[PDB]
Symmetry: D2
Subunit: 430 residues, 4 copies
Amino acid sequence: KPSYKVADISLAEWGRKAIIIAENEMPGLMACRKKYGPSKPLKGARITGCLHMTVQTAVLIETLVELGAQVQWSSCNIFSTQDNAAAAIAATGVPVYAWKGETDEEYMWCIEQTLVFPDGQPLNMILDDGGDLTNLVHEKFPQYLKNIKGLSEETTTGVHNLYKMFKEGRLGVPAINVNDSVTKSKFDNLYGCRESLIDGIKRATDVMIAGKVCCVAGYGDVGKGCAQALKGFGGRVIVTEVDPINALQAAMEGYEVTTMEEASKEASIFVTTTGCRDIITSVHLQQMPDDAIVCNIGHFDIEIDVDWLNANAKEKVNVKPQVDRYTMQSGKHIILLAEGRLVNLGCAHGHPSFVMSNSFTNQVLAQIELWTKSDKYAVGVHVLPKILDEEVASLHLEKLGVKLTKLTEKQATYLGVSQTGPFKPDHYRY
Amino acid sequence: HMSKPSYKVADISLAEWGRKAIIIAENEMPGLMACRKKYGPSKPLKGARITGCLHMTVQTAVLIETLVELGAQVQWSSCNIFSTQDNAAAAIAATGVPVYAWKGETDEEYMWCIEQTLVFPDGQPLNMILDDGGDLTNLVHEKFPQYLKNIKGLSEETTTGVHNLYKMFKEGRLGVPAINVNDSVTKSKFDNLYGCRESLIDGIKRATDVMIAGKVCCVAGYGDVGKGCAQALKGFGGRVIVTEVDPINALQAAMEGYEVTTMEEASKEASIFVTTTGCRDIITSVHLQQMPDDAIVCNIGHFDIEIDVDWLNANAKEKVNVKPQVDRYTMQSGKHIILLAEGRLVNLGCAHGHPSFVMSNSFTNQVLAQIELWTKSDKYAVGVHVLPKILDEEVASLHLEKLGVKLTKLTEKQATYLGVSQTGPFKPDHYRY
Amino acid sequence: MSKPSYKVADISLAEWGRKAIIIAENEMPGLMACRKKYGPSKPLKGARITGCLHMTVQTAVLIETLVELGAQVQWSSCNIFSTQDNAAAAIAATGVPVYAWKGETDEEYMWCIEQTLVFPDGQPLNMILDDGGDLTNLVHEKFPQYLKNIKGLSEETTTGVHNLYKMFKEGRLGVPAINVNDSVTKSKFDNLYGCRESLIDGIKRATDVMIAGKVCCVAGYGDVGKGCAQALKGFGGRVIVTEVDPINALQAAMEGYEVTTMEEASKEASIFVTTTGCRDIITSVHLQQMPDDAIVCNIGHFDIEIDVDWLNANAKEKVNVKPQVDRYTMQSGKHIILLAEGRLVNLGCAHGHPSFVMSNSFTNQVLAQIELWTKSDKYAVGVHVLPKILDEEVASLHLEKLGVKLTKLTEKQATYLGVSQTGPFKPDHYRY
Amino acid sequence: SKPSYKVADISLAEWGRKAIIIAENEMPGLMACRKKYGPSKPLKGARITGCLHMTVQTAVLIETLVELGAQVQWSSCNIFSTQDNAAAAIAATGVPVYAWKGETDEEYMWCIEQTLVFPDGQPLNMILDDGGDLTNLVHEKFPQYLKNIKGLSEETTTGVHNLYKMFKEGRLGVPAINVNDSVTKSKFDNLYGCRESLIDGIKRATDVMIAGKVCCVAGYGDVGKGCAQALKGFGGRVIVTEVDPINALQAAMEGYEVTTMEEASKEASIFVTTTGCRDIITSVHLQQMPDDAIVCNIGHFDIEIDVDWLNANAKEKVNVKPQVDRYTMQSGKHIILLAEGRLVNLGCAHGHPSFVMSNSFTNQVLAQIELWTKSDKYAVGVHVLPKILDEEVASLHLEKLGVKLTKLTEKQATYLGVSQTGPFKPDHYRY
Ligand SMILES: NC(=O)c1ccc[n+]([C@@H]2O[C@H](COP(=O)([O-])OP(=O)(O)OC[C@H]3O[C@@H](n4cnc5c(N)ncnc54)[C@H](O)[C@@H]3O)[C@@H](O)[C@H]2O)c1
Ligand SMILES: NC(=O)c1ccc[n+]([C@@H]2O[C@H](COP(=O)([O-])OP(=O)(O)OC[C@H]3O[C@@H](n4cnc5c(N)ncnc54)[C@H](O)[C@@H]3O)[C@@H](O)[C@H]2O)c1
Ligand SMILES: NC(=O)c1ccc[n+]([C@@H]2O[C@H](COP(=O)([O-])OP(=O)(O)OC[C@H]3O[C@@H](n4cnc5c(N)ncnc54)[C@H](O)[C@@H]3O)[C@@H](O)[C@H]2O)c1
Ligand SMILES: NC(=O)c1ccc[n+]([C@@H]2O[C@H](COP(=O)([O-])OP(=O)(O)OC[C@H]3O[C@@H](n4cnc5c(N)ncnc54)[C@H](O)[C@@H]3O)[C@@H](O)[C@H]2O)c1
Ligand SMILES: Nc1ncnc2c1ncn2[C@@H]1O[C@H](CO)[C@@H](O)[C@H]1O
Ligand SMILES: Nc1ncnc2c1ncn2[C@@H]1O[C@H](CO)[C@@H](O)[C@H]1O
Ligand SMILES: Nc1ncnc2c1ncn2[C@@H]1O[C@H](CO)[C@@H](O)[C@H]1O
């Protein structure tokens, strides 16, 4: 029924204006529009999408439509949506069903609306962050896997699901994984969360990082950026890790590596980045000092046990939205952010638009590659080619005023690499 | 009897939220809390009526209530139209403290708010002055010199203000003893530095959400605020260019990986601009005309002298308010200029200012100076004074426990060798830290 | 007029090298655990391993670790300025054949490699450990008959592996080969953190120049250039970066570095660092524009990234300040300081990467030799990387020296993340 | 002064000269002093005795003073600091140089004693000092010269603490300029210079990896700030010790853990003393230190570490290289001491780079002129150079670094209450 649901459509004015600022911050999406605009390759493809309903997503949705595609959209998180960007998109008649403060019930209903298209035909393509949509079409009625071509996935959690969905019958549709692109994982994960995380803590807490002991759980791409942020603001950062390689990395970069049992006692600020269950537990929380802040920057709220805390705290006081302060039976206080969910999105606006142009430009491509080259893409995981990975990166250099050297003909022969690309072997880790 | 507002605040309903945020802040401000335990039972500020014109913040509420717990009547205003946090103002007003402050203030209103704080509820005029920027101080001097005979003290908090103070004593135009809280090492080298390190990107990000990395930034000035401002942008991946008029500060910046060029050159390259000089005319028409599209322009030095906002408003094809304190000028060239806080302090205008922990250092010096000027007035003089180093070292000592520092005690052998006391003072007075 | 057994410069330095070897052992936890683990079972028994690696204090622990695993080892350096003379004498004094000294000639360099090929039992080498591909090349070009009995080669550097892949695309690879460089425990540690410290050390020992305030150009933002640029930035330099790859170029901009061309950097920069592995990075055009007394150094393997021959051909005067530190007076009258004749400045002007990071690279190397000697089979003719199970063991072996307390996944968590509690913890496409 | 000069190997002079030539291009302030004051020869008639590390940088200072009319004689202030090639270059030039690396304490004192009376049999009229050793020799011994000495300049925080203490005790006999506490020395040489020189000396001595290691810096002043930043940037985790709450808060706001030596001596493998105070590392701490810990001192004097106990109570002492000693403790653990506890940058490397030393030595030359020319502007007592001179020192180095400084308009300058040529800051500005 509802053409759209977006909280307050009066915010559309504000949103169009953050959109136009984002377009200036998202030159890769803009270069897609000039390069692929004339040819409109996504024509007659109706794509349901489940991603944070941010202004940067509006630029992606709108780049998709300018590339000739019908688009439905719904947020991958309850607090991920920015309500200004919601109304602005829906004021253009692109059906969007999403708002901040969703209920788990409201969250999954919106996805049901996106599977439908206003014309009526089921769908042809799918773009997802996490697996909720991907899983729903599978686990909740698969009648429309055949008509559609393929799917696109962003998060490293949801990519893990798709790799393991291909251990058996799952993946009735061919899939590209846009996370394992370097222009995504080595930028969004690391460079983005470097900006987004501290932003979210400040807005919720306005706490001083300088001189505070900080614990980062996980020293992967997200963990490396989160620790760099706090180290750069005068924080001393202890790092927890289960992988030997990442541990040596943190240690060779000046970070003490030890267990949460040790770190829960010393540190005052806690950020979970592992993508694994039960990073902060009961024993840990009771050991933390008074008014310690505990947040999670990984997909899914299973890294901290909010359930135990909600249950074993004496009092739960809501300071402001997504900021809850618990008074433990001990008398120490625990401040929780975003109920342990995606803090950058819950207590701020996520990664800036520029790094999202690298992410969503890969996604534009992934979507073109599946529909125009369905012959090339058997059902399974796929990963985009490298000259395409390099092309996303090359599209942001002009904005950054980067003057890139071109290899001499004699030079390229020496390196076995074409002058135009690709420049690195497949195994290259960057 | 024309009756007088007991307070003027945006929404008194916000009192409950402010109390909550205050309580969180108190626990991250040990120095103010320590001041309450040591001097509070002895009411050192009894009989003193302090008038305060400082950005009305959560942190400033802990300062107000600390002075009140130390036996002082307090009335407050903000030194900026955009600096006041409304939730803290409501809470302090809900404590029977006359406060006249709200975000979104007009210049006429701002002046009205300060004048309401001069006379306390019994008709008696103010004894004491706590000021940031000089506006209240100048007001009493200029318009109300009748009050200065019975004003025992003046304390000032910021660099632009201490400069006005000094040349007021130089011109003979200062008539009350004064203390320079900004040049206590615990504020100068922590607040102006470590606070702006964190407060500047908070203001920028909240208004714009802009990625610092890969971007050319300009920091006009490499003083305490500029040193903090450049370190933050460079730690976020920014390429920072600094301008400087003192050769020493330019050499400091050069030796720390920064290019030092003129603002004429930087307007070409930089997309982000922060002004921190306390000086006028740092960004001019020529500078803004050179700037790239959607360049973000902000000012962290006290007062809107550094950028020519008056030119911008008057010479733009179009001006659009994205949201409060964020305006985007569509210039004659077709380029766009994103201005933050209308050329006013971006950290308090587009965010909540410096963190509570570092503000405890500054406000602890403030409480202490107020005790000095009230309880030991005959010691002081009309001039411009600085707290003793034994007191500056105390400020720091109060904050070490919260961070977990374990300071080492000098032996009697070590003390005599260095010629100091095991208790201090530990450094010479010309020591720059 | 007879095979020398060993040729080093000053066998007197043995005691000094042996005392420095004891310190390095205590800084190389992986190699020592290799001796303790693999020593008793002697898996390199029968192997006649020829190695062409910089004859350093760190390489001596590698040689003696291979001998403790049963191997017969003979050695030459892969660069004429890299050999540390105390290390070379010590190893020679134990009786292991080593032909390496600082101050070698190109003709003496080849002589040294040729002396490592046939062992004192009169038998040619059955295993190769190369750094640069030169020993690999020589054996394929000049001595192809020896390839039937070479059960495998292991290569430590990015440039040698590029030679190996091109060899195998063509029909030119004679043996099975392992690529130690692109083990995560090498590239992301040795090339990054190693060059972070060794590049500055080299310039400092050679020049004693200040990094604070200087404009610096690093050509390349690979693993070497990332760490080189990080080092200079940490001492107060502003580092201009040149790049041909869009991905590295974006990475450098996100780390606050200006990315431009050498054409422009040659004007502003006073310190020049080349890290690409490609010829002709610094040309006559670039050297003529440089500021007076600019320092030019190359941390790439091979001296092709700068035109030293042009500097020699077209300059008014060359003065030698000290060994490996040469000042050219150009026709302009401006001065150009060249370190180590364009050869690896860390190895040439200092001692190279520190021992601890070399334990991670050399422990991969010890592992690869075992693989090729002991499991020839799973290793056909081609270029192979070590398995992640063992990549992780390299890092695991170094965590206690650094005090790191690692975390054990609960069986619940491991089943959630789909991993063994003992690894491998990541997919092979992980870029770390 | 019978020997005229005593240097280790005069045969190394040509090498030193080639190295001093490269140093001159990195030292514009001293060169500009030769340009400006060259013709006037303002220090003409000046017999200057110097007691600073005999380095290539000290040599550019020596010859700059000579360009300015002065006759100078030089000794080193540390037994291991002298660079022998530079002493040889200056010795061959005729300026009497009495310094060699690895002196003995007895030889060290005899070296300084030759510098007092110049070759014509006349005593010195000017003192230039680093550590106060020469200053105290002239006061405590040979005190008859103090009346024909117009002044002294001191480089070192230690030197000036002693100089300030001398004035309290009434013992200071000459007007003394405290060169150390000029901003262009303290905030650049002690900081930026020790950041590069400390890591150099450890590396040349040990070749140890800084990454992954735990390190402890005792003190967080100008030296300890730079020493700690240096190690943290190469991947090390730095623990800081402090007796002053202000410096300790600073170190904490920068992410460093501040704790006692008793705790850090157990975790960290690298130890550098930066306080200028006695008894920083003791037997208690040394026994708890991890096996093969590297312990060094960057303070002017070798009092922050107890080498006497290490020698007396260790099982073995093995010399790896000059100024590198590995002690085997009764525990079996090993401790590596650098340069026998003395200054490790100058002992195991070549000290601060030349560019930062130009800032320091340009202050020194200006101070010597002021005391020799404007002798009446100065009464006995410890003084500092004017801010207009300090600002100048800095201004003379901006061109080399490419710095394009902003020039204030008259409206701006009157608004700030400042001249367009300075001084631009209140004298209490800490920068
Ligand atoms: N908020 C965002 O915008 C954003 C961006 C990127 C990724 N993510 C999410 O964050 C999560 C991690 O992302 P990633 O890119 O860093 O993947 P990653 O594999 O590279 O990092 C996770 C690391 O945590 C470690 N780990 C696993 N269980 C652990 C434990 N109990 N303690 C410590 N470490 C443990 C692993 O060893 C692993 O290296 C993913 O779920 C991803 O979806 C969020
Ligand atoms: N918003 C905040 O949180 C906050 C905090 C502290 C101070 N301040 C204010 O910021 C301003 C300056 O702070 P500060 O402590 O660093 O003062 P400062 O004296 O230490 O630094 C100012 C520097 O700017 C330079 N300068 C002056 N005019 C210049 C010009 N035209 N171009 C370039 N440089 C110029 C000076 O050389 C000086 O070194 C003051 O107005 C102060 O009141 C704001
Ligand atoms: N000094 C040492 O101890 C040491 C250690 C490891 C590797 N190396 C050697 O240094 C070189 C690089 O090693 P690596 O790991 O970083 O390889 P890499 O591939 O990761 O880095 C090379 C980079 O240089 C860039 N490049 C290539 N041609 C260029 C050009 N004309 N201008 C600018 N950039 C150009 C490439 O884009 C590439 O990103 C190799 O020769 C390697 O064998 C030396
Ligand atoms: N090697 C060099 O080239 C070089 C360069 C500059 C200075 N120095 C010398 O290094 C020493 C320090 O120089 P500075 O400028 O930094 O002086 P400083 O006063 O600024 O720093 C000394 C710090 O150590 C602290 N301290 C004092 N006693 C202590 C103790 N027992 N434990 C811990 N901290 C203690 C003090 O609080 C002080 O902050 C002096 O001897 C100075 O002469 C050497
Ligand atoms: N949160 C805050 N509350 C009150 N004053 C602040 C805050 N942050 C910064 N300031 C002060 O505001 C002044 C700038 O006008 C500075 O002196 C600074 O110390
Ligand atoms: N100190 C060292 N000793 C031995 N080999 C080294 C050292 N430092 C670097 N290397 C090696 O030399 C190679 C250069 O070809 C590097 O890739 C690295 O493996
Ligand atoms: N390389 C050097 N040459 C000469 N003096 C130096 C050098 N490095 C440091 N110094 C000086 O030595 C003093 C320490 O005793 C410092 O004040 C510093 O100025």
